[PDB]
Design a protein around this ligand. Structure first.
Ligand SMILES: [Cl-]
Ligand code: NA
Length: 253
């Protein structure tokens, strides 16, 4: 009778993916973050049940200072653990506690084959192909912060903020669909976009693009954080974290 921890997530390939099911046979989740979660579950002896953030968002600080999304679920005490493709950021570290990272994060751009965008810089220099990101996400917040900083050294960020300031989507799937079928470029996690590009049945895409990382979020003060971070470091040191990565990014495009 191990305690059942409530895990809040956002669906996002290949980090957390569902298998939908029929006739009362249980819905199951899989992916890189589920494997890491499982490695931790097996170690602490907890069970868990997963639910998706009700608003389908990662979360960002709102006009009135409250948090929504996955990060908000933690702040509002609705969950014990938050895990997805969740980017560790200083603003989020203000209201929840992150583990050490279990994988590096970077920003990429998903583009339709036949376009001629070779860099995030080129993308920002035009307005013809419209572009954007997922609302209430770390990308949105980062582009805003850098784009509004007069002392930012790369002028691309100000150009991006002009375009993005709410061209955005509610969920990454919508952004991917817009690139595929419309006239759009989608700015999102490189790890997600690499997986999407290499697995697209039509090879419709290419991508262009480690100072931030993916982390497990816990309520502030949680006694799981140190224990998790220890287990994460162990997994990295042994090569086991790399084995997990290769399972989900076996880069064979
Ligand atoms: Cl979701
Ligand atoms: Na914190």
């Amino acid at each position: 009778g191990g305690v059942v921890l409530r895990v809040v997530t956002v669906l996002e390939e290949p980090f957390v993916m569902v298998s939908e099911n029929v006739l009362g046979k249980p819905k199951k989740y899989q992916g890189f973050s589920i494997d890491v979660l499982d490695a931790l579950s097996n170690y602490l002896g907890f069970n868990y049940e997963i639910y998706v953030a009700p608003d389908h968002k990662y979360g960002s600080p709102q006009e009135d200072g409250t948090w929504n999304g996955l990060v908000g679920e933690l702040v509002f005490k609705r969950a014990d653990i938050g895990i997805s493709a969740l980017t560790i950021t200083p603003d989020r570290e203000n209201v929840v506690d992150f583990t050490t990272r279990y994988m590096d994060y970077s920003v990429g751009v998903l583009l339709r084959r036949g376009t001629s965008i070779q860099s995030l810089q080129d993308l920002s220099k035009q307005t013809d192909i419209p572009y954007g990101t997922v609302l209430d996400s770390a990308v949105y917040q980062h582009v805003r912060m850098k784009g509004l900083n007069p002392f930012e050294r790369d002028s691309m960020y100000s150009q991006m903020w002009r375009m993005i300031n709410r061209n955005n989507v509610l969920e990454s799937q919508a952004g991917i669909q817009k690139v595929k079928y419309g006239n759009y470029a989608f700015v999102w996690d490189a790890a997600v976009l690499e997986y999407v590009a290499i697995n697209d049945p039509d090879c419709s895409f290419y991508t262009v693009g480690a100072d931030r990382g993916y982390g497990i979020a816990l309520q502030h003060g949680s006694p799981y954080r140190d224990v998790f971070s220890q287990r994460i470091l162990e997994l990295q040191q042994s090569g086991d974290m790399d084995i997990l990565k290769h399972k989900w990014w076996p880069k064979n495009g």
